[PDB]
């Protein structure tokens, strides 16, 4: 039943058996549940504050090819851009002026940067008393040492998917292997660290969101990014069917019952496929907006997948209209950096 399915998260049975009903069940009564439970269970743990974190997409310059995203290498229809250093820092203050307590460093795999540039950017925008996540993707561990010793508070690298054989088909330059590794490696150096998976990519099953799902509570990560996959019209999976929006919203809904105290963002990909998909995604578990800090001319050139939001409003736009999103959803903005406050339980 999906009463009893409900009744089994509730009471924290988290089987396969248990998940994959879950994931499978295609009834609204369920589903209605499912995210009233999920949302409860975020205001009773993490409350009612949506922290912000500003992403500035500093560099959409990429080594690797996935086949997934419209910054691999081969793709060469790309304008190319890289902000300076004196760019990136100038544009994190601007975002701490406007009342940003975490700020997000995202880009391609760019080797400019890597390690130094990187480290001393870091060290600017801490000075400015404020939360730093990084996502640059796969480094050495070497890298990572010295972006902690710099001062990065956090890092984002999603698992993708946990299908070691889809993760390599998709990823070829790399592997599951390589980013699990990774994700350790940056647990070990003390880092909050976040992964998450893709939705619908092409060939993933069921079985498959379930492995996520199991993966993402077995490493009790600190932060959980998921999201649709969006096909890129100028990629090798240009012609593969987008992934379902309610399918992803589960995936959420069930990463909050998984991991009542972590980190949750409504990411900008379940607010591209359907108009106002992040406000029903705060509604289902999530707790964080990361709005689009990265200047004009560049933010309409960091295209990952097509349509995504933002690309045409002013500059400084995004953190007042997510500060207008937390006020309509009956939510409250951020007051500290919003790191994981764990609670302890059995
Ligand atoms: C009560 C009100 C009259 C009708 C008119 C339009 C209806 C909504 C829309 O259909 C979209 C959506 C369809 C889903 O299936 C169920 C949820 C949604 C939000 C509906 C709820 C409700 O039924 C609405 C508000
Ligand atoms: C606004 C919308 C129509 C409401 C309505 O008109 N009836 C009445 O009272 C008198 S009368 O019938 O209107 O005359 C209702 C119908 C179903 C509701 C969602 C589901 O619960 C799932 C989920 C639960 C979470 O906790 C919060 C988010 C979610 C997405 C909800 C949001 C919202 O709440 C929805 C869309
Ligand atoms: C940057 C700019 C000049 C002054 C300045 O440099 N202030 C630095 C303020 C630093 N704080 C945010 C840490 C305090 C100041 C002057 C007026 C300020 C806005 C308004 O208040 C409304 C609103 C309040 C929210 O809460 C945060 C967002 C908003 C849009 C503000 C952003 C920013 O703050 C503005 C633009
Ligand atoms: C109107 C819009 C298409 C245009 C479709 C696409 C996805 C749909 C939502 C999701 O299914 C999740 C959720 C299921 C609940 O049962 C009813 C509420 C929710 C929020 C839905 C409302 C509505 O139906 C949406 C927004
Ligand atoms: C300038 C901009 C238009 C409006 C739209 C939404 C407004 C915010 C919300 O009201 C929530 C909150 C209420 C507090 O009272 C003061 C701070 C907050 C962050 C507001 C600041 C400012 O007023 C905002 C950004
Ligand atoms: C663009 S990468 C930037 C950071 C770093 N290069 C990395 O790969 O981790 C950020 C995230 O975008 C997401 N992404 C890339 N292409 C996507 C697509 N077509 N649809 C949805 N999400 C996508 C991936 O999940 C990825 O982790
Ligand atoms: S997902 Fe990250 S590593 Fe892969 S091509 Fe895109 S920017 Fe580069
Ligand atoms: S942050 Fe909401 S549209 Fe840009
Ligand atoms: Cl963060
Ligand atoms: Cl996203
Ligand atoms: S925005
Ligand atoms: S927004």
């Not at 809904?253 to 963002?265: E, F, K, M, Q, V």
């Not at 933010?299 to 409003?313: D, H």
């Amino acid at each position: 039943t999906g009463r009893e399915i409900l009744e089994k998260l509730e009471r924290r049975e988290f089987t396969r058996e248990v998940l994959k009903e879950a994931l499978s069940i295609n009834d609204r009564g369920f589903n209605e549940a499912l995210f009233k439970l999920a949302d409860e269970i975020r205001r009773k743990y993490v409350g009612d504050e949506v922290h912000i974190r500003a992403i500035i997409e500093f560099s959409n310059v990429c080594r690797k090819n996935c086949l997934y995203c419209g910054l691999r290498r081969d793709n060469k229809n790309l304008k190319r851009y890289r902000m300076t250093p004196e760019e990136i820092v100038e544009r994190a203050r601007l975002a701490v002026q406007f009342g940003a307590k975490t700020i997000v460093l995202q880009s391609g795999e760019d080797p400019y940067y890597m390690p130094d540039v990187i480290s001393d950017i870091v060290k600017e925008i801490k000075k400015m008393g404020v939360a730093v996540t990084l996502s640059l993707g796969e480094w050495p561990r070497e890298y990572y040492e010295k972006w902690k010793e710099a001062g990065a508070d956090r890092y984002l690298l999603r698992h993708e998917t946990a299908n070691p054989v889809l993760h390599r088909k998709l990823r070829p330059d790399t592997s599951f292997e390589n980013r699990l590794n990774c994700l350790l490696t940056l647990k070990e150096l003390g880092y909050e660290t976040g992964a998450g998976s893709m939705v619908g990519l092409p060939g993933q099953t069921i079985d498959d969101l379930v492995d996520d799902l199991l993966f993402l509570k077995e490493h009790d990560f600190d932060m959980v990014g998921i999201g649709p996959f969006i096909p890129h019209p100028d990629t090798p999976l240009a012609n593969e069917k987008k992934g379902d929006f309610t399918l992803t919203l589960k995936m959420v809904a069930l990463t909050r019952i998984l991991l009542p105290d972590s980190n949750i963002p409504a990411t900008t990909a379940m607010g591209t496929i359907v108009p106002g998909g992040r406000e029903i995604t705060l509604r289902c578990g999530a707790n964080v907006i990361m709005p689009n800090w990265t200047p004009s001319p560049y933010r309409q050139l960091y295209q990952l997948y097509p349509g995504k939001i933002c690309v045409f409003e002013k500059d400084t736009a995004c953190i007042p209209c997510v500060m207008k999103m937390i006020e309509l959803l009956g939510r409250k903005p951020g007051r500290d950096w919003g790191g994981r406050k764990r609670v302890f339980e059995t």
